[PDB]
Design an enzyme around this catalytic site. Sequence first.
Site, mmCIF file in Angstrom:
data_model
loop_
_atom_site.group_PDB
_atom_site.id
_atom_site.type_symbol
_atom_site.label_atom_id
_atom_site.label_comp_id
_atom_site.label_asym_id
_atom_site.label_seq_id
_atom_site.Cartn_x
_atom_site.Cartn_y
_atom_site.Cartn_z
ATOM 1 N N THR A 1 0.845 -1.165 0.249
ATOM 2 C CA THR A 1 0.064 0.108 0.097
ATOM 3 C C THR A 1 0.808 1.294 0.159
ATOM 4 O O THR A 1 1.703 1.367 0.970
ATOM 5 C CB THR A 1 -0.793 -0.134 1.222
ATOM 6 O OG1 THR A 1 -1.894 -1.100 1.298
ATOM 7 C CG2 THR A 1 -1.698 1.194 1.242
ATOM 8 N N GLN A 2 0.677 1.941 -1.112
ATOM 9 C CA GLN A 2 1.365 3.260 -1.195
ATOM 10 C C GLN A 2 0.655 4.621 -1.264
ATOM 11 O O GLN A 2 -0.541 4.358 -1.341
ATOM 12 C CB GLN A 2 2.397 3.263 -2.594
ATOM 13 C CG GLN A 2 3.469 2.288 -2.555
ATOM 14 C CD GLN A 2 4.473 2.397 -3.734
ATOM 15 O OE1 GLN A 2 4.496 3.601 -4.422
ATOM 16 N NE2 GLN A 2 5.058 1.483 -4.174
#
Lengths: 240, 235, 222, 212, 231, 231, 195, 244
Positions: free
Chosen positions: E1-2
Amino acid sequence: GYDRALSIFSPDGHIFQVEYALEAVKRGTCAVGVKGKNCVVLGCERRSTLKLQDTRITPSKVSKIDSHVVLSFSGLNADSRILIEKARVEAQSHRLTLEDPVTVEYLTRYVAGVQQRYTQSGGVRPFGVSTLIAGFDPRDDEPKLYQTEPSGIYSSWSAQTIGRNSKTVREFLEKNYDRKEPPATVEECVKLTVRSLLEVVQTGAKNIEITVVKPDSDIVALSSEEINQYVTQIEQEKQE
Amino acid sequence: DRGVSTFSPEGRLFQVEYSLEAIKLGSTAIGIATKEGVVLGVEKRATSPLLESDSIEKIVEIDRHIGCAMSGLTADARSMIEHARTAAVTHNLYYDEDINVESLTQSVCDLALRFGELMSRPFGVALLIAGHDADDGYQLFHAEPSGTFYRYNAKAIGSGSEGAQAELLNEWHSSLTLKEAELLVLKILKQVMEEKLDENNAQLSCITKQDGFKIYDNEKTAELIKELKEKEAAE
Amino acid sequence: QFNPYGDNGGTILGIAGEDFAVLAGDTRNITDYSINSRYEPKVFDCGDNIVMSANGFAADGDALVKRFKNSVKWYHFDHNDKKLSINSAARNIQHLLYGKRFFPYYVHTIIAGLDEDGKGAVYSFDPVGSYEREQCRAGGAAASLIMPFLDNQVNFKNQYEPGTNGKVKKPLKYLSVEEVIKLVRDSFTSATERHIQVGDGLEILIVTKDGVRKEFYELKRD
Amino acid sequence: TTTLAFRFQGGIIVAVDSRATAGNWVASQTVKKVIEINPFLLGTMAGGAADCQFWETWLGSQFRLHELREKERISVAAASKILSNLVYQYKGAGLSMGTMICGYTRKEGPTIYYVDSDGTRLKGDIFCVGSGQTFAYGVLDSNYKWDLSVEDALYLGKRSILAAAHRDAYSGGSVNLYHVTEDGWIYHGNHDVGELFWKVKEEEGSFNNVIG
Amino acid sequence: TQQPIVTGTSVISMKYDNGVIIAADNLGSYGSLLRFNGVERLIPVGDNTVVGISGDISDMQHIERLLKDLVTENAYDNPLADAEEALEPSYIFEYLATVMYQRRSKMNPLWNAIIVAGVQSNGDQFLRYVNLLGVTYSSPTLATGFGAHMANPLLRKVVDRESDIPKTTVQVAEEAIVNAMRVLYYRDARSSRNFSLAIIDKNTGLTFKKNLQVENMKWDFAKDIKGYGTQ
Amino acid sequence: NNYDGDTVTFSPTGRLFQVEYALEAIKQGSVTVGLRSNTHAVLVALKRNADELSSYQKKIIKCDEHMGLSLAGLAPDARVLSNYLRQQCNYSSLVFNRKLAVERAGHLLCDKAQKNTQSYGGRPYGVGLLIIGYDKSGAHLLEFQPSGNVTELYGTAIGARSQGAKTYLERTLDTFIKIDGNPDELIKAGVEAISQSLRDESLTVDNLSIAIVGKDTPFTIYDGEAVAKYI
Amino acid sequence: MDIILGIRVQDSVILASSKAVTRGISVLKDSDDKTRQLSPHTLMSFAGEAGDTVQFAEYIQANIQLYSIREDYELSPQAVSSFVRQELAKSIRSRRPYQVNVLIGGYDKKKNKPELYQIDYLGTKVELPYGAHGYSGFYTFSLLDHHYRPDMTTEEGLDLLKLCVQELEKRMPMDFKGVIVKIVDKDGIRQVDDF
Amino acid sequence: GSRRYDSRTTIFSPEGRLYQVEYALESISHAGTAIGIMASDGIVLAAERKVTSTLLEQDTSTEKLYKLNDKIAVAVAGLTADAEILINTARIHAQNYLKTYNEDIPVEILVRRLSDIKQGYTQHGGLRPFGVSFIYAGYDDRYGYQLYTSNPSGNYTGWKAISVGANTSAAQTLLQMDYKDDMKVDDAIELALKTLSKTTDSSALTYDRLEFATIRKGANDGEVYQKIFKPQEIKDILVKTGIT
Ligand SMILES: *[C@@](C)(CO)[C@](*)(O)[C@H](Cc1ccccc1)NC(=O)[C@H](Cc1ccc(OC)cc1)NC(=O)[C@H](C)NC(=O)CN1CCOCC1
Ligand SMILES: [Mg+2]
């Protein structure tokens, strides 16, 4: 982990480690199994060079795997404990998943499979043990007697013996046991078993163990006096 | 000592060649393939008369359309059969169909050379795998511990193999009936066996498209033994 | 937070005849309110007279088709060039989909071809692998529009024989390839009118014993 | 789904509907919710569809392996427990399965086991499973006796599914009937609710809530 | 998750009769801050392919290193590395597409939208798109971000379908691209005036143009607009 | 002698005897021939049987639509190596949408065989392979040896009495290399080549095995009545 | 699951366990036995999360049966309860804990005394004259505080138990379909068929 | 590779014997003799220290006799270092059992597990076996007073009176001669010392060359007490029996 292939083929096509494990069985105290019409009897030799023993606490030669199946053996005593333990665990595991106790054939097939695995696994030697597995399948009155050996082969026997001087007692059983008419009663079966051991043992005092297994988890071990009565009876009939 | 996966100067694996010697010591097993089915027969060879011969299981079902006979260190065959059965059922699960006899044999033979320093030694047992499928019909395969397999019209393995194979060479033709093949296995088994052949020390089986793999009863085999003796005396 | 799924729109349709089967799908590809491509095929020839489409999230769709095509290839290697039957293909696809039960392929899958008796066959799947053989199935965005029309025109649902007092049903019969293509074209033009994610073009793959043929038709581009 | 199976004098009746749903969308009307495991074993399917279809098919493979290894058909108890232990390993992961393992063996006789994705395993004479189970129970319980005939038992099972097919919005399509005896299972046909409802209404005089 | 930090905006492209054109501005935005102005977002691979990248710049730089390493690896034990066994646009794309989809499947995506433009060895035009989700598609015109909303409509007036490609010259095609870049500068709040453009032709090869500017802008009408209603 | 116990030991003259013993297993294997022109590449293999009742061991294996090999020696080892090639060909297709070069195929086999000749416990592969294929640089023929050595050739042969066919091909080099656009004539030359390695036995219908790959010809194998044409 | 009770009297331990198995708005079964015999003189009742209950009970049962075969000897109720407690104590800090509460009723043959142990899913063990799990205790404990005497007979214990079931049937919201009662004493375990 | 240097510790001889187990027993036969005698009201453990030096600290020493828990003790014969590895395992195993069941471990269960560990070293792992033989002396409420022995093979047996280490053949004959079943602890103390006094390789048996211990129910009412004898206490018991 220790990986060495200890059990391997030789030029003549033999696996010497498996064959030498059979020699350990041949050294072990004699064990005999005789199945009658409604029972199986397991007889076992106990060597008499050991006095000052405590028979209350000394490990018995015949072991209960479940309430309905028993296992006797010939060979290395320490090795046998490992097979018995595994078998006892598999017995409870079978009851847990199938909701039914093991058949004698199934329990034998498992024990035989463990023995076989140790003949082609790296870093281990074969079990120096042959077993006699006897009992009655759940809700069945047909007697069952099976034999296993270090190689992993197993088979059913009307009567069989293993251990030291087993070839002498097998000779006895081969002519004395009738396939068409097995020992009809418990007494007849026990007597034939004691007779067969008396060909080899020495004295019928604290040298012979007898265990009787009957249908529906009915297993009992005979005491000294009970066995001694068979010994006394056989010898008196012999003098003829 | 020496490595388990070592080559000889002639270009063969020592352990594989030594396992072949173990298979020669084993009891005889014969298979014959016809257009009406494939027949499998074995010598039981009980070591003692007290041993209950019906507990000697040297012919085995893998699936309904595939059967198997063995010879050599028969304890080694248990894990091979277990693998074959799982392979057959697993393929049915993944593809909703019967698995080809050749594909099954190939899967069993993939275990063969998975040994070294995986299991510690090769298998000491040879297998005759017989079956039927829709593509290539009735088939017989000889699976060795070398990892190699040959298809055969007929094949014998075990102690009396070279003598029995020479006999199968003369007797086999492409128009054999199932009944003719049954008698032929019994005939050749009786020739190479030490003890006298009967229903208790020899076992028959077959695989047909219609009825699948069936091990014969001791009553059924006994009649075929009696039919065989009469036909040889008749000329 | 990162959302690993998307919706690429479009719709697909499979019909089975007596000795043939069709698998149709529109060629539009979208995200949100934008058109990505007016011609991006999603109905594929996978070999062995099996056509396939996995409509929904295109990345998962392409991944699945790619894996199945590869499954067909290794089936030949491992089983002596044996033809993969449509029923066997269907079961294989179930395992591919159910393998990702807890992180699913967001697609409605349909395959078409001929069964082992030579008769037309259509199989359809949910995202996690449940499948069923049918004469008829629509999938994708406009499935809800097209499917009831197919129930009526292919399986003759709710149609009775005139003058029989609603007692005798209209008898089931196979449709000709000419009649089936008429229904496919009308199904997609109708879907294009009322669904914004459907349009641009229609590509049909027809499967007979002779092989896999293609047909293309224009659709409204608004 | 609505599925039922009940024990009686003449063996076991098993009846299921054929509807598949995706919310309020009717996904199918022709789904097979009974799986024929072997000539003596049946499995019913309710809940998640891939879950049921996949694991009960896998289930049949395990039972085939049992009879190959043990040279004997698997017991209904052991069969149902393989499945219950399987779903218990997945407990919490979100499997959805409401199942009934129905069959006959010599040692057990006719036996039914309820198994669900919670890990609940129950032996019993009567069960109804699925979104419309309550509707089936209402008809089945109020008409059930042990001494029903094979003909009457088949009809009650059929009529109980029909009842649920009518009232439950997530049940319908058609009724699949089975009868399990000492000789194995016997299929008693597919019965479309489209024709069956009116046939039952007319002949039985029931369903007076509906406009005739 | 960015979450993407330093970002690049639209990448636009189209096909013409002999090849393909691709363009992208030279800006590296840090949210609303127009932080970096010398950023090259078109990266050539060989003499027959240009990869245009939008989205996260740290991830763009990672992809640069992968393509750079791909050229090195292809040259290993390859006598025909500059001939028959050179890297094709279709090879380069399929590689990236595989990576993008693998990363999204591990819930750790490369936060980018990518367009691979080039010409194949047989002369065929190659133009295909791939993004952080691993979604891929091809079209006569392709664009990312705001470009998809504003450039594509303009480029599709020139090439609306396949049959319009042979009828479109490089002069007409480049004119449309340069016009689209101007419109994006008018309307995209994270765009810059400076941009790069690349042409890959089957005859003249790769032409890479740097330091282009948007020009011929209409701003004069602004002086007449007073207030918001009644002023 | 004392230096042949395992593959990890060098002899005093710098020889690896286990690798040489593995090489010996190939010489015992049945003869197989490989040759090519500029358009096509052909494998011809003499199959061997256990006896008249047995089948003839299959020598030729398909790796991809454009590549495959023939074997001589331990067949299970050929199965392992061929399977590895199938995977490597397949990896090239899925990831790069690229048909694996026949030269890279050889390099990959070399490196796989090598690792088995330098580590304790393992053993060398006991099989020789002839790989044919048609890729972007035309037709190719390779010869694999389990020492790791791979060689690209116009024609060759391995197995028992392979020297006869190898001499013939060395004479016929100028003729068969120019058999372009004619499959049947290139096979005829290969069938005539393998005939020079025959003793007492002749080529029969279920004995001969032929495979071909080329410009407009996928890798296909011919057995049974399909090879009766060439006897 | 829901109602499990236990009462230790002079010469025996009595366990009462509800027969209902409910899921949703349907009573799926009304003859369920919520107990397992661990050994000839030891009985364990259980209640809690569906699936977990039986899986845990049978797992303990297998272990105790294994011990019995190995040593040819029956573990004391105290020893079994300590084993059970430790298993639950491990469980509570696992990835997915067993959500099972148990009562262990046993007759110690060496001491010639009945023993009742209450153990919750956390591994909280207590020896008690009377015990209960779940909402049952909110009625039965105060009732037994009043009516229980330590020197009561098995018959007096059953009447005392009837008094508990009657109160629960009167004031509990759910229909638990009666109880299965079992007695543990010097002669082993037996079921009361008419309750 | 390394195959060259492997002794193969876990293999069979052609006769079906375990080489390393047999050779470990040969090692143990040179160790100081240890005797265990079981009476009706207690158990005696006696052991001869290996050739003592006059400058050895005797009172703060432990070579032969070790405490496993409050109810069980062992006499050692063989490599002390090997024995201590096994003793710490046995001590832990006892505490695991107590933690699990809230009951002191039955003597046999402890003995079996320790014997099973030895067995493992003879069947797998490629390591040498433990060169140790134990005499277990303990009490539990099932079988009461118990004597056991285990050896490198992992095989164990129960005894009324037993010796391990050096001169067991001579020692076992003497015990078999004078032992009887109705024997008391104080008599067993005398028998143990007399047996060592005759089988010893030393000139004369003295207090400084002995370790001694008893396990009686000689505490106050229905409880067991372990008494590891002090030097002065051994000196007194040696005079009291008339050996010195
Ligand atoms: C009735 C119709 C109530 O649903 C039955 O339970 C029916 C049983 C059944 C059994 C075998 C084959 C078909 C149908 N169940 C369904 O139709 C089922 C209902 C359902 C949906 C989702 C669930 O979440 C776990 C549980 C039950 N429908 C489906 O499974 C549909 C066809 N597929 C999907 O919803 C796809 N989902 C499944 C869950 O994972 C995400 C994708
Ligand atoms: Mg529009």
